[PDB]
Structures are given as structure tokens and as C-alpha cells.
mmCIF file of C-alpha atoms and ligand atoms in Angstrom:
data_model
loop_
_atom_site.group_PDB
_atom_site.id
_atom_site.type_symbol
_atom_site.label_atom_id
_atom_site.label_comp_id
_atom_site.label_asym_id
_atom_site.label_seq_id
_atom_site.Cartn_x
_atom_site.Cartn_y
_atom_site.Cartn_z
ATOM 1 C CA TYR A 1 -0.083 0.070 -0.194
ATOM 2 C CA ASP A 2 3.108 2.164 -0.418
ATOM 3 C CA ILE A 3 1.605 5.444 -2.754
ATOM 4 C CA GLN A 4 5.128 6.613 -3.591
ATOM 5 C CA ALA A 5 6.831 3.043 -4.615
ATOM 6 C CA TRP A 6 6.069 3.529 -8.600
ATOM 7 C CA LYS A 7 8.641 6.074 -8.896
ATOM 8 C CA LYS A 8 11.753 3.697 -8.121
ATOM 9 C CA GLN A 9 10.001 1.107 -9.996
ATOM 10 C CA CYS A 10 9.697 3.025 -12.871
ATOM 11 C CA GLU A 11 13.378 4.253 -12.620
ATOM 12 C CA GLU A 12 14.488 0.562 -12.336
ATOM 13 C CA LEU A 13 12.436 -0.348 -15.486
ATOM 14 C CA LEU A 14 13.832 2.703 -17.452
ATOM 15 C CA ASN A 15 17.396 1.476 -16.652
ATOM 16 C CA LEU A 16 16.851 -2.124 -18.052
ATOM 17 C CA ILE A 17 15.404 -0.603 -21.121
ATOM 18 C CA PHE A 18 18.524 1.710 -21.505
ATOM 19 C CA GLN A 19 20.726 -1.496 -21.233
ATOM 20 C CA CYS A 20 18.506 -3.348 -23.977
ATOM 21 C CA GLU A 21 20.275 -2.797 -27.603
ATOM 22 C CA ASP A 22 16.569 -2.372 -28.991
ATOM 23 C CA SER A 23 16.285 0.882 -27.250
ATOM 24 C CA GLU A 24 19.248 2.578 -28.986
ATOM 25 C CA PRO A 25 17.051 4.448 -31.649
ATOM 26 C CA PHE A 26 14.583 5.607 -28.997
ATOM 27 C CA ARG A 27 17.270 7.240 -26.317
ATOM 28 C CA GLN A 28 17.191 10.441 -27.893
ATOM 29 C CA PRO A 29 15.134 12.497 -30.164
ATOM 30 C CA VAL A 30 14.550 11.222 -33.846
ATOM 31 C CA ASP A 31 17.300 13.384 -35.998
ATOM 32 C CA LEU A 32 15.746 15.431 -38.480
ATOM 33 C CA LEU A 33 19.024 15.411 -40.803
ATOM 34 C CA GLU A 34 18.576 11.831 -40.872
ATOM 35 C CA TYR A 35 14.692 11.932 -41.594
ATOM 36 C CA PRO A 36 13.786 15.321 -42.876
ATOM 37 C CA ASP A 37 9.875 14.794 -43.343
ATOM 38 C CA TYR A 38 9.701 13.415 -39.840
ATOM 39 C CA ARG A 39 7.850 16.453 -38.133
ATOM 40 C CA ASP A 40 5.513 16.447 -41.345
ATOM 41 C CA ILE A 41 3.821 13.018 -40.287
ATOM 42 C CA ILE A 42 4.699 13.317 -36.248
ATOM 43 C CA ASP A 43 3.129 15.999 -34.366
ATOM 44 C CA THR A 44 4.469 15.271 -30.697
ATOM 45 C CA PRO A 45 7.763 13.613 -30.487
ATOM 46 C CA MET A 46 8.799 11.667 -27.578
ATOM 47 C CA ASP A 47 12.175 9.589 -26.396
ATOM 48 C CA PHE A 48 13.307 7.494 -23.391
ATOM 49 C CA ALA A 49 15.953 10.441 -22.303
ATOM 50 C CA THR A 50 12.937 13.022 -22.146
ATOM 51 C CA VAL A 51 10.660 10.121 -20.074
ATOM 52 C CA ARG A 52 13.589 9.637 -17.606
ATOM 53 C CA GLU A 53 14.151 13.527 -17.272
ATOM 54 C CA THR A 54 10.326 14.192 -16.425
ATOM 55 C CA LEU A 55 10.444 11.577 -13.904
ATOM 56 C CA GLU A 56 13.582 12.655 -12.146
ATOM 57 C CA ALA A 57 12.305 16.501 -12.277
ATOM 58 C CA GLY A 58 9.401 15.417 -10.221
ATOM 59 C CA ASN A 59 6.832 16.228 -13.339
ATOM 60 C CA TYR A 60 4.998 12.826 -13.044
ATOM 61 C CA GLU A 61 2.174 12.622 -10.647
ATOM 62 C CA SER A 62 1.645 8.854 -11.379
ATOM 63 C CA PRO A 63 2.774 5.972 -13.297
ATOM 64 C CA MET A 64 -0.235 6.378 -15.597
ATOM 65 C CA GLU A 65 1.239 9.610 -17.112
ATOM 66 C CA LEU A 66 4.750 8.034 -17.804
ATOM 67 C CA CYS A 67 2.830 5.048 -19.433
ATOM 68 C CA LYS A 68 1.165 7.588 -21.835
ATOM 69 C CA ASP A 69 4.635 8.965 -22.779
ATOM 70 C CA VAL A 70 6.052 5.601 -23.323
ATOM 71 C CA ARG A 71 3.277 4.712 -25.534
ATOM 72 C CA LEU A 72 3.765 7.783 -27.628
ATOM 73 C CA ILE A 73 7.516 6.482 -28.368
ATOM 74 C CA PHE A 74 5.808 3.138 -29.665
ATOM 75 C CA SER A 75 2.771 5.165 -31.497
ATOM 76 C CA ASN A 76 5.095 7.475 -33.166
ATOM 77 C CA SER A 77 7.175 4.649 -34.591
ATOM 78 C CA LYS A 78 4.285 2.970 -35.916
ATOM 79 C CA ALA A 79 2.916 5.983 -37.583
ATOM 80 C CA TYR A 80 6.460 6.890 -39.178
ATOM 81 C CA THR A 81 7.517 3.569 -40.527
ATOM 82 C CA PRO A 82 7.117 2.795 -44.350
ATOM 83 C CA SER A 83 6.714 -0.883 -43.836
ATOM 84 C CA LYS A 84 5.383 -3.236 -40.933
ATOM 85 C CA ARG A 85 8.914 -5.152 -41.705
ATOM 86 C CA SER A 86 11.277 -2.237 -41.128
ATOM 87 C CA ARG A 87 14.168 -2.871 -38.854
ATOM 88 C CA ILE A 88 13.900 0.372 -36.417
ATOM 89 C CA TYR A 89 9.843 -0.469 -36.079
ATOM 90 C CA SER A 90 10.678 -4.383 -35.408
ATOM 91 C CA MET A 91 12.764 -3.044 -32.579
ATOM 92 C CA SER A 92 10.077 -0.901 -31.197
ATOM 93 C CA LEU A 93 7.434 -3.960 -30.920
ATOM 94 C CA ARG A 94 9.812 -6.058 -28.978
ATOM 95 C CA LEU A 95 10.506 -3.031 -26.666
ATOM 96 C CA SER A 96 6.824 -2.479 -26.420
ATOM 97 C CA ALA A 97 6.064 -6.330 -25.373
ATOM 98 C CA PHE A 98 8.977 -5.738 -22.875
ATOM 99 C CA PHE A 99 7.597 -2.754 -21.361
ATOM 100 C CA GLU A 100 4.050 -3.851 -21.186
ATOM 101 C CA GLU A 101 5.089 -7.133 -19.186
ATOM 102 C CA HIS A 102 6.866 -5.100 -16.596
ATOM 103 C CA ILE A 103 4.514 -1.708 -16.132
ATOM 104 C CA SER A 104 1.296 -3.931 -15.373
ATOM 105 C CA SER A 105 2.282 -4.672 -11.838
ATOM 106 C CA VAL A 106 3.454 -1.143 -11.401
ATOM 107 C CA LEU A 107 0.117 0.321 -12.407
ATOM 108 C CA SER A 108 -2.082 -2.466 -10.298
ATOM 109 C CA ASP A 109 -0.029 -1.927 -7.085
ATOM 110 C CA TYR A 110 -0.277 2.034 -7.306
ATOM 111 C CA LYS A 111 -4.026 1.918 -8.206
ATOM 112 C CA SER A 112 -4.523 -0.779 -5.131
ATOM 113 C CA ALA A 113 -2.451 1.503 -2.906
ATOM 114 C CA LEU A 114 -4.601 4.876 -3.591
ATOM 115 C CA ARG A 115 -7.855 2.711 -2.903
ATOM 116 C CA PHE A 116 -6.474 1.462 0.404
ATOM 117 C CA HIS A 117 -5.638 5.342 1.163
ATOM 118 C CA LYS A 118 -9.305 6.434 -0.028
ATOM 119 C CA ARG A 119 -11.070 3.183 2.023
HETATM 120 C C1 12Q B 201 13.064 6.588 -37.576
HETATM 121 N N1 12Q B 201 12.256 5.730 -37.675
HETATM 122 C C2 12Q B 201 11.448 5.474 -36.454
HETATM 123 O O1 12Q B 201 11.687 6.438 -35.560
HETATM 124 C C3 12Q B 201 10.601 4.636 -36.155
HETATM 125 C C4 12Q B 201 10.320 3.850 -37.299
HETATM 126 C C5 12Q B 201 11.103 3.733 -38.327
HETATM 127 C C6 12Q B 201 11.094 2.818 -39.262
HETATM 128 C C7 12Q B 201 11.708 2.620 -40.514
HETATM 129 C C8 12Q B 201 12.621 3.479 -40.651
HETATM 130 C C9 12Q B 201 13.028 4.495 -39.757
HETATM 131 C C10 12Q B 201 12.270 4.704 -38.658
#
């Protein structure tokens, strides 16, 4: 029933993600010299360094907010890919499966802790 425990849990999950080779294209903003049409397709850029900095600044109130930004990384990759077989899209799908497998207990524990607080 610890309402604050999600923050360290999310820091540890982001450290695992940074150690994964599949995260390398997503650790920093997409390079516009490499992909000059990117902002014609993608309205709201996101990357894992931005997510980690927002967490460390104390600018997430809940793990739901962090999960929305991570899911935006993956939806942007799906929208920009020219093919569902592309190398960088293929990396995003494996990273998404890993993230969803680990975030489910973080979300469930936080929501249970808040319900106990409000009982
Ligand atoms: C830059 N980039 C992305 O950021 C995401 C998907 C993708 C797929 C193929 C080629 C480049 C790509």
C-alpha cells in the first residue's frame, strides 16, 4: 500500500530499457537531418531520455502519466514506419512487449494503494 513506490520501480524499468540494444534508436529525439520529413508525419516527438528526465525532475504525478508518454514513443514509430517489416519498427515492437509485461504490476500496485488510502 506504498503510494510513492511506483517512482523507483519506474526508474529501475527505464534502466533495464536503456541496457537493451533494441532501445538505441529511441534513447534521444529522432534526428531530422537523417529523416527530414519526420515532423510532417509526427506532431508530438517523444524519447526515453525525455521520459527519464521528466521522472527525475518530479514532473510525473502517477505511473499512468509515464505510461502514456512511453506508449507515444511506440505509436510514433508505428506512424512513421514505411513498412511493418522495417528494422527500427521491429525493434519498437519487441521493446513495447517488454515494457507492457513489466509496467502492469507497477500500475496495479499504485491503483490498489490509492484505493486503500481512500477506503
Ligand atoms: C526513424 N524511424 C523511427 O523513428 C521509427 C520507425 C522507423 C522505421 C523505419 C525507418 C526509420 C524509422
